[PDB]
Amino acid sequence: MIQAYLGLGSNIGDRESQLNDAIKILNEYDGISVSNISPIYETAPVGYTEQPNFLNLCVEIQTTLTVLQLLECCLKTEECLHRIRKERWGPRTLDVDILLYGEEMIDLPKLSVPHPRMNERAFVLIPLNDIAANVVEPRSKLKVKDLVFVDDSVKRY
Ligand SMILES: Nc1ncnc2c1ncn2[C@@H]1O[C@H](COP(=O)(O)CP(=O)(O)OP(=O)(O)O)[C@@H](O)[C@H]1O
Ligand SMILES: N#Cc1ccc(CSc2nc3c(=O)[nH]c(N)nc3[nH]2)c(F)c1
Ligand SMILES: [Mg+2]
Ligand SMILES: [Mg+2]
Ligand code: NA
Ligand code: NA
């Protein structure tokens, strides 16, 4: 059993309902057990043009799947929630990202863990710190509570 952390986001449709459905579906896979769920945050989009605000949260899982098995389950969940993949990025019903997988570091074409952008993302670290404050991010070797920073664009929903 490995403790892993997922980052979930939604910015189109009924965001809260889609996040809750996603969690339920994730927990229904064998090999994945959801053991904790952060509060939901409303967050301003980063890395792109002006876009609808996200609802974001983090989930703790206990898993017996390999990291690529886990990735398959995360992407299947997005398909369940009808995520659209157009030529250009845009709003999404659901995004399920693998943030941490034990203290492992994986660098494959299809998979990078820890997530390559998490240490500079308040929409990850704020909810992650709610459920994983003492977990070590293995590249920095810092605990999540030592990475997290104040950011007013992330607000409790
Ligand atoms: N840690 C990770 N979690 C999820 N997918 C990952 C991943 N590392 C690499 N990927 C790959 O990223 C591919 C594209 O996924 P998208 O969800 O479209 C990226 P995104 O989540 O919108 O951006 P982000 O990675 O900046 O958060 C997936 O098909 C998967 O192979
Ligand atoms: N429409 C949209 C859209 C916005 C940003 C990116 C770039 S990645 C990304 N994901 C998140 C997330 O979940 N929350 C927040 N707040 N910002 C994020 N940026 C994108 F591809 C598409
Ligand atoms: Mg993703
Ligand atoms: Mg993402
Ligand atoms: Na399960
Ligand atoms: Na790589």
Domain ranges of the chain: 1-157
> Could you tell me the two tokens for 94?
């659901």
Name the experimental technique. Answer: X-ray
Q: What is the DSSP letter of 86?
A: -
Q: Single out the residue of 113, 95, 4 nearest to residue 46, CA to CA.
A: 95
* Phi, psi for 139 (deg, rounded to 5): -75, -50
CATH code of the domain made up of 1-157 = 3.30.70.560
The amino acid occupying position 64 is T
Catalytic residues: 83, 92, 95, 97
Specify the resolution in Å: 1.5
CB contact burial 104-125 (16+ within 10 A = b; e otherwise): eeeeeeeeebbbeebbebbbbb
Q: Report d(CA 47, CA 9) in Å as an integer.
A: 14
Q: Report d(CA 93, CA 90) in Å as an integer.
A: 10
CB contact burial 49-86 (16+ within 10 A = b; e otherwise): eebeebbbbbbbbebebebeebbebbeebbeebebeee
Q: Report d(CA 128, CA 132) in Å as an integer.
A: 6
Residue 43 CB less than 6 A away from ligand 2: yes
Å from CA of 154 to ligand 6 middle: 29
Q: Single out the residue of 116, 118, 98 nearest to residue 2, CA to CA.
A: 98
> Could you tell me the two tokens for 138?
């293995």
Burial class of 1 by CB neighbour count within 10 A (0 to 12, 13 to 18, 19+): exposed
3-state secondary structure of 84: coil
Q: Closest-lying ligand to the alpha carbon of 89?
A: 2
Residue 4 CB less than 6 A away from ligand 1: no
